[PDB]
Nucleic acid binder design. Structure first.
Ligand code: ATP
Ligand code: ATP
Ligand code: TYE
Ligand code: TYE
Lengths: 427, 427
RNA sequence: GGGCAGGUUCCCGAGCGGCCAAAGGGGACGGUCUGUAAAACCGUUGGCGUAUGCCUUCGCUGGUUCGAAUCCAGCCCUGCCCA
RNA sequence: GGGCAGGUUCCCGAGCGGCCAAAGGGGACGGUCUGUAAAACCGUUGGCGUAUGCCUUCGCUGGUUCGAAUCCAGCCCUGCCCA
């Protein structure tokens, strides 16, 4: 694909690219551009949200450009204020580096690892030794009125909500990473406009070609309103078992399916529109199958498309009705979903042995058992859950909080619609 | 003097000491307290303004405490925003270190140098290696709303006047210097409240006894309104020749004499009040004599008082009329003042030889001569000055801008009331 | 990144095509009155041996016209409103 | 540094001396209806082998009273107004 042609593929599904005429230009230079993308391991594991920007990076690699993944072990220590309406809490450099592990491992599910298209870097490499005098020069490149001109900060300032002064350095620390690696393009979610812009500003200061800001739409999380985030618990991990990933995707609030196909799949608007035709449930089945299938593999395919869907063994014309077809892992997944919907037990449930000592008088109080089992944070809670008709013992809905369970033979504990644990005597 | 007693001597003439009960306490610890006082050599030479805080430091040394003079060669690079209503301009670390020279030399005119009472330090020693991570911790000790709560910043922000973000680090850089040397007390002009307070804040963060902020009144400069400053050209240098120092003090606007005696001398309110009795001119004579006398010496006396005034040979009862009395240097000084008032020539005038080549046709144009002499920035100016009846040749008020001066024998050039230069042929 | 308002001489600031080295105010400098003060008042506030001559100064770099501080073009910087 | 208003449970937030493990709203969790969705509705929202018993939780540390989340004292932190 020639320049003019690449700028298209890339431009598709993208929120905004500014300044676009510069990306079109850089493409014409016939040399691997440097595509930057950082992530602050404040919490482990990546998720479908990240997949939004990562699949895009992948696509840049696919057109021969090099991607540099910046693991913000340092920045993550400071905490990125973008969005947050409250100072993010502190994090030690040892912590962020612990999380980083997951990020490296996991990025691979979407990114290419071939050395000429992928470099890994932790900004703590070049940021710890940034000198006080050097900082002063960065922070002198912008004015107070400009910082406060940010959505996030404005609101907070006006609302009289504390803003730690250090929260103002973050933009610059991120900005530097750009200079650090002469980035041609910095990838990002829309909530990174500001940071990506300060990146251009700081690059000029260091006499470098101002990177091309590439913003991707933000994927909304399972709650329906807020964006997917590791801190909001509304995400679908990139490395959850197919069972889990499949069920969660079956829960993506209806009003979002359109967005999910656009940001997570490669289906033509037409194919999407016709899917919603079949209705909500059917679409979910499809969306779920694709992604559970895709992320099941060691690395997703260059394109999650109608063909890829069919290559699995499904009939696009079947619109999800063809449950039987499909991989012997996505199958069982969708299968577990349905059994549970019906109110049946999942085939494979986690067993958890219970030391005879934990017994008392030969039995064990249901309240405590559910806790010893990790289904309830505590007896009191269990009790409460039971009064609320929320736990089941061997399929039967418990009703006697004082119940004394007999662990002679295994038992199948249950909490809510889909949390199962088989337990037995081991001691 | 016991603690309770010291807290008094010190408290006299001082703007405010906060928190006072802490200084009273520290005094009782019977151990040399650490009195901090920094200065940013943005421009060379100290002046009577500085003398305000320096004489106070001296007094702390006089009661046995140790003074640590911090030469802000680093801070001076950043630029202290206090007061300034516009970002101070940049300064290289090599520059500030050039100026520093003057400051060390000159501080001595007021400060004691005995090692157990005086230490010299350039904060660039401990500030250059302050790490980015370390900075983040300093700037996290305060909120935006608090920075903007400053007189200086508020005004500017509201007034829509640019505030470089780096201007916000200065407080912290100064604050650190406190931690750096476990300062018990930081001295300062009232325009340093904020900085001195952030110093306590930052000390707590580093688990140190929050220093005692000691604010001294600001001495107003010769203009009459604005405070004396190296950047406003309204100062009287601590190391100007007695001639100069004497004449400038004879120009201290009347409405300020009270302040000048209080901040620069050690005369009881009573003595001051009775001086103003004699009237303006007489008081000036006295004020001038004292300080010109005092700063004439290699180091001022512990107290510029009525006794010291008399020890010079003056009659306090004479109220300045006794012009003859006095040192053979302060005498000639006051003498030059008067001759010039009368319109006479000063005895000792600076000569400046003029290379025959500079001649043209045997003469030299008055306009150019005044420039070759350093009395006028340029011919045009000279011409203009002359049209304005502002230059004199040999006592005669020039009137012919095209005049061709004859440098056969010396000539006495003059610009305004008191700028004289004798010039002659040398080549 | 996008919209609008700004960028001019020491500072702030007016600026129209040629009347622009460029209004006014401030500051500062000279001067008068004085006390080598203040106030008031009167001037000055790009440079060149002395000048229908040239250069420097209107954010930068180009261009239009005979002629650009004004106009056009790209870029830089600030405030506000955005994102 | 000084004045005033705040600091309470996952969040925001009411709080009076004992009625406080502490109102209400949000979120979240259970449940009903469903499509393992939404909306609506009904509950839950410190812990302890099962409890006129104790502990943890009202910014920190002390103290008053029989009894403190409420009161007093010093200190910490935030917003506004100051300096
Ligand atoms: N839900 C999302 N949808 C789309 N892109 C996302 C989403 N979350 C994060 N990203 C992108 O991934 C990049 C890395 O995110 P990172 O984890 O560093 O911070 P974050 O925004 O706090 O993440 P989280 O959303 O997990 O809080 C972001 O710069 C953004 O471009
Ligand atoms: N006119 C003055 N009157 C009284 N104290 C002064 C005066 N000028 C400066 N000081 C004091 O001297 C200290 C050192 O001043 P420094 O030269 O570092 O900064 P500055 O305030 O810019 O000085 P300047 O007044 O020369 O601009 C200040 O912290 C202040 O305490
Ligand atoms: N700050 C972004 C969100 O956490 C991630 C990041 C982006 C760019 C970097 O150079 C570093 C981190
Ligand atoms: N910032 C003050 C005025 O210039 C001077 C100063 C005061 C304290 C220091 O630690 C350093 C400099």
């Amino acid at each position: 694909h020639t320049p003019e042609e690449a700028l298209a593929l890339l431009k598709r599904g993208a929120e905004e690219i500014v300044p676009e005429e510069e990306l079109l230009a850089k493409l014409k230079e016939g040399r691997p551009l440097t595509v930057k993308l950082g992530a602050d391991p404040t919490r482990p594991d990546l998720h479908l949200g990240h997949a939004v920007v990562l699949r895009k990076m992948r696509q840049f690699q696919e057109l021969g450009h090099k991607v540099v993944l910046i693991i913000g072990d340092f920045t993550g220590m400071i905490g990125d204020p973008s969005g947050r309406s409250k100072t993010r809490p502190p994090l030690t450099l040892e912590e962020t580096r612990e999380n980083a592990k997951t990020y490296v491992a996991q990025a691979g599910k979407i990114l290419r690892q071939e050395p000429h298209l992928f470099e890994l870097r932790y900004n703590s490499e070049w940021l710890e030794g940034l000198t006080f005098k050097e900082v002063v020069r960065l922070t002198s490149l912008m004015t107070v009125a400009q910082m406060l001109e940010r959505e996030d900060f404005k609101k907070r300032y006006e609302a009289g909500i504390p803003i730690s002064l250090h929260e103002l350095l973050y933009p610059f620390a991120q900005a530097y990473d750009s200079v650090a690696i002469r980035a041609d393009v910095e990838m990002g979610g829309t909530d990174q406009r500001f940071n990506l812009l300060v990146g251009r500003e700081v690059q000029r200061a260091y006499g470098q070609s101002p990177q091309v800001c590439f913003l991707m739409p933000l994927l909304v999380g399972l709650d329906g309103r807020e964006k997917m985030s590791k801190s909001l618990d509304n995400y679908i991990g990139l490395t959850e078992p197919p069972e889990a990933m499949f069920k969660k995707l079956m829960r993506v609030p209806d009003p979002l399916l359109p967005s999910y196909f656009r940001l997570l799949t490669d289906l033509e608007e037409e194919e999407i529109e016709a899917l919603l035709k079949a209705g909500p449930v059917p679409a979910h089945r499809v969306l779920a199958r694709l992604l559970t299938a895709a992320y099941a593999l060691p690395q997703i395919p260059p394109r999650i498309d109608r063909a890829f869907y069919e290559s699995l063994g499904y009939a696009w014309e079947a619109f999800g009705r063809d449950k039987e077809a499909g991989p012997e892992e996505v199958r069982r997944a969708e299968a577990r979903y349905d059994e549970v919907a019906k109110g049946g037990i999942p085939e494979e449930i986690p067993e958890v042995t219970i030391p005879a000592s934990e017994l008392k008088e030969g039995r064990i109080w249901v309240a405590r058992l559910f806790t010893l089992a990790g289904l309830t944070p505590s007896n009191a809670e269990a009790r409460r859950l039971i009064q609320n008709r929320g736990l089941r013992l061997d399929g039967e809905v418990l009703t006697d909080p004082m119940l004394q369970v007999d662990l002679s033979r295994p038992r199948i504990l249950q909490r809510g619609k889909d949390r199962f644990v088989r337990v037995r005597l081991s001691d």
